[PDB]
Design a binder for this molecule. Structure first.
Ligand code: YGU
Length: 821
């Protein structure tokens, strides 16, 4: 196995070569491939000449475009503010679940708020071991007849672990971190031999401008500092006197034309403060406008002559996006100021001097100057993280990740070099971790910075708030949507995706505005931050809420999942169904499977629903399992047993009810099944005038009730399907859809011209055909998860937790960003 790293300079190639020799990672060999600039390396990776390189966030954006098609895969983790510990958040969530779902696991947290390594389930007496995330170590479960297991101690905090590593078993003459009671870094740190002291934030990162030799006064160190994003800053010497608003005509040093801290951040501020006569691509390029602002600068990668005048690279290396240009990068821009080739340098806080005293200070955009350690209040914005990138195909992602993980475990010299600073990686980097598997530049940079960088390259025409771009998931839906657009007078437009999850992505990225989602997709949609705008109201009995919008809805009419049993079986209750014979509509059905399996796993330590029951019939299971012993199959024996078709006699709503009456104790079905197949409503012989009063439903409290009281004695009611959109577009989508519905709904004024809830092109296109109307979602002041799902469903299916991962999109769309207001 090989990893080919692309280097951009003679110096970087030298450092990469040293690592080939010094860093011994078994199974994976590092190799180094030289190119003359950042852009030539991005092309080498696209072409397969190399596999990986580390990019500034600005280049991560550029590399994500179709010319290169690269994606970020590895980066240093950062924090925005202090958060609750995971155990305490989990406790709060589980305690907020539906109390009618009894016997649920409530985590046990220790005096620091972390998980006790031994976790126990009070209602079942089972205990197990967990990792620091509170996730069960599989295979450690012990029954209550046994003593609690012996579980390894918690992994130490960063500070306590670095302290243990610094001691290394018996220390003298080296820095040993000082930790607080909670195991985080004390704000002030001192070197036990040199007498120097400095400040660190809560995860131990040094605050620049605070390093203090012994015998001098230290700057005040801020406590509980969990803001670890990097900040773009403008650095100047204290010997000059101009302010930020007088930058016109000065000399400047920039980390690079494509760097976020050296270009996007200052240019964004220049434009907002109207220092730069530029607003759109009608006034030419921004680089040309910047060329007229400064008298002479060094901006590696630039083409304008005066913007390369201050660079000192020799011959063709001059003004290159490469360390062979001595003023390239954060530390090159600072050197350019230090050597008086510029009056101001644009870089980020992590490249500022560590020492408190000296001739440098910060140039604030509010026309003041402030000391180096005040960058959090004297900056040009937070900037995104930087990242290792590879091809979008990801053919080398695993080898790249494995090599860097092992190299860091072995403490290879990745993050420094005698040859120079910020070679291969930023010298300030301490750890590189894998990004979410579905991350891309949009989700890595965040929508605010992604759009901000795009705005510098093109005039982004923001779509109209009077048009709803509807996302369709198949060709018939696209065609029905084009007919809607033709009658809509411009209110409706159409986009195409392959599946509802890709529609959610389009809405997040501003390519579409709305889509209707099945219940099985709403957890993902809500975790990515979309909101229900309107919902499909399916109650055929009551049309009052459709005629008079905003009025009270007595019954929304969604299905209720119930546990159906016979009146003769007096001994069966909810709490004793273990080992009994059950009948499910099919695997994957929400009322017949997802809701029952969710409650069973919630109350029995995630024990398989296959193992919970004795002999069941659930179409879709393995034919040899206990879940297919009850399944008959085709009465016209061909074997089509336990099959997901009508060939199975026990398939579907009617089939699961047949399984109950013929050979079962309980059936998991919607509440409408028993009424639609008893009282002689089904002509077949198996239900020869079967009586509805012959059956009852099981309540979660062990009691029972007649099938008529399904509203108060059910496993869970389902939420309605929802039309989702971005938070800032809810009001527009509601307004446009309600107006369209007054024209083309079931009582629309122009329903002869178009019908939203039917089509000759197919069934359930865009909306479900049995929809009565769309009802505005009335957002309540509570968690959107509980608001949309209802507490019962939220608890039964997701344990009332925001930590479930039913789609691998969730870790990417919840990745946190370094954005400004
Ligand atoms: N805001 C809000 N309006 C309701 C409508 C349905 O009537 N849409 C939902 N998805 N909901 C879930 C229900 O929850 S439940 O607990 O009543 O089942 C609810 O009635 O609260 C509701 N929440």
């Amino acid at each position: 196995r090989h990893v080919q790293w692309c280097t951009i300079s003679h110096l970087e190639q030298k450092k990469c070569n040293d690592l080939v020799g010094s860093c011994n990672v078994p199974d994976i060999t590092l190799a180094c491939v030289y190119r003359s600039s950042t852009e030539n390396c991005m092309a080498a990776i696209k072409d397969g000449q190399a596999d990986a390189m580390f990019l500034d966030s600005g280049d991560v954006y550029k590399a994500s475009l179709d010319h290169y098609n690269l994606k970020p895969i590895i980066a240093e983790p950062y924090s925005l503010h202090r958060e609750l510990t995971k155990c305490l958040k989990h406790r709060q969530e589980s305690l907020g679940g539906d109390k009618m779902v009894k016997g649920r696991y409530i985590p046990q947290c220790d005096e620091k708020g972390n998980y006790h390594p031994v976790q126990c389930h009070a209602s079942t007496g089972y205990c197990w071991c967990v990792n620091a995330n509170g996730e069960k170590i599989e295979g450690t479960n012990t029954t209550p007849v046994q003593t609690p297991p012996t579980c390894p101690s918690q992994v130490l905090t960063k500070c306590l672990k670095e302290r243990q590593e610094a001691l290394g078993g018996k220390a003298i003459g080296r820095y040993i971190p000082q930790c607080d009671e909670q195991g985080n870094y004390r704000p002030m740190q001192c070197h036990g031999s040199t007498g120097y002291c400095w400040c660190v934030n809560a995860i131990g990162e040094k605050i620049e401008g605070t390093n203090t030799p012994p015998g001098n006064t230290q700057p005040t160190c801020q406590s509980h500092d969990w803001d670890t994003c990097h900040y773009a800053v403008a650095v100047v010497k204290n010997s000059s006197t101009f302010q930020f608003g007088q930058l016109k005509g000065k000399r400047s040093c920039h980390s690079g034309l494509s760097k976020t801290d050296g270009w996007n951040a200052p240019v964004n501020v220049f434009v907002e403060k109207k220092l730069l006569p530029w607003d759109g691509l009608a006034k030419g390029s921004i680089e040309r406008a910047v060329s007229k602002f400064f008298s002479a600068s060094c901006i590696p990668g630039a083409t304008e002559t005066n913007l390369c005048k201050q660079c000192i690279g020799e011959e063709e290396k001059k003004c290159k996006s490469s360390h062979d240009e001595p003023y390239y990068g954060d530390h090159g821009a600072f050197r350019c100021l230090q050597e008086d080739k510029g009056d101001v340098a644009f870089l980020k806080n992590t490249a500022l001097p560590d020492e408190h005293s000296g001739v440098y200070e910060l140039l604030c955009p509010d026309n003041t100057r402030k000391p180096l350690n005040k960058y959090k209040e004297c900056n040009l914005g937070k900037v995104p993280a930087d990242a290792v990138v590879t091809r979008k195909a990801g053919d080398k992602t695993k080898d790249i990740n494995d090599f860097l993980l092992e190299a860091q475990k072995k403490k290879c010299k990745l993050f420094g070099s005698p040859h120079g600073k910020d070679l291969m990686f930023d010298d300030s980097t301490t750890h590189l971790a894998p990004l979410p598997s579905e991350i891309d530049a949009f989700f890595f940079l965040g929508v605010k910075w992604y759009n901000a960088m795009k705005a510098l390259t093109e005039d982004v025409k923001l779509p109209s708030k009077n048009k709803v771009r509807w996302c369709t998931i198949n060709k018939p839906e696209m065609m029905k949507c084009k007919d809607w657009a033709a009658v809509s007078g411009g209110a409706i437009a159409c986009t195409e995706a392959s599946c509802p999850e890709h529609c959610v992505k389009q809405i997040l990225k501003g390519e579409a505005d709305a889509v209707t989602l099945d219940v099985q997709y709403m957890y993902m949609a809500l975790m990515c931050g979309l909101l229900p705008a309107v919902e499909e109201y399916p109650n055929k009995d009551d049309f009052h809420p459709c005629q008079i919008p905003g009025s009270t809805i007595k019954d929304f009419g969604t299905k209720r999942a119930v546990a159906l049993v016979k009146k003769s079986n007096k001994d069966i209750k909810w709490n004793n169904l273990k080992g009994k014979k059950s009948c499910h509509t099919h695997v994957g059905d929400i009322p017949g499977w997802v809701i029952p399996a969710g409650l069973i796993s919630n109350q029995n330590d995630n024990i398989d629903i296959e193992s919970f029951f004795g002999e069941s019939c659930a179409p879709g299971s393995d034919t040899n399992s206990k879940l297919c012993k009850l399944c008959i199959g085709d009465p016209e024996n061909p074997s089509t047993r336990c099959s997901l078709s009508d060939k199975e006699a026990y398939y579907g709503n009617e089939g699961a009810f047949r399984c109950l009456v013929e050979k079962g104790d309980v059936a998991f079905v919607p509440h409408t099944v028993v009424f639609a197949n008893t009282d002689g409503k089904n002509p077949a012989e198996w239900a020869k005038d079967l009586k509805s009063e012959d059956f009852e439903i099981l309540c979660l409290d062990g009691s029972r009730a007649p099938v008529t009281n399904y509203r108060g004695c059910n496993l869970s009611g389902l939420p309605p399907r929802a039309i989702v959109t971005r938070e800032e577009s809810v009001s527009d989508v509601v307004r446009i859809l309600i107006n369209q519905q007054s024209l083309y709904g079931r009582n629309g004024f122009e329903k002869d011209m178009f019908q939203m809830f039917s089509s000759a092109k197919g069934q359930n296109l865009l909306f479900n055909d049995e929809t009565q109307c769309l009802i505005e979602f009335d957002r309540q002041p509570k968690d959107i998860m509980e608001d949309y799902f209802g507490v019962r469903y939220y608890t039964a299916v997701y344990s009332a937790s925001r930590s479930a991962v039913p789609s691998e999109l969730i870790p990417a769309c919840t990745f946190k960003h370094c954005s400004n207001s």
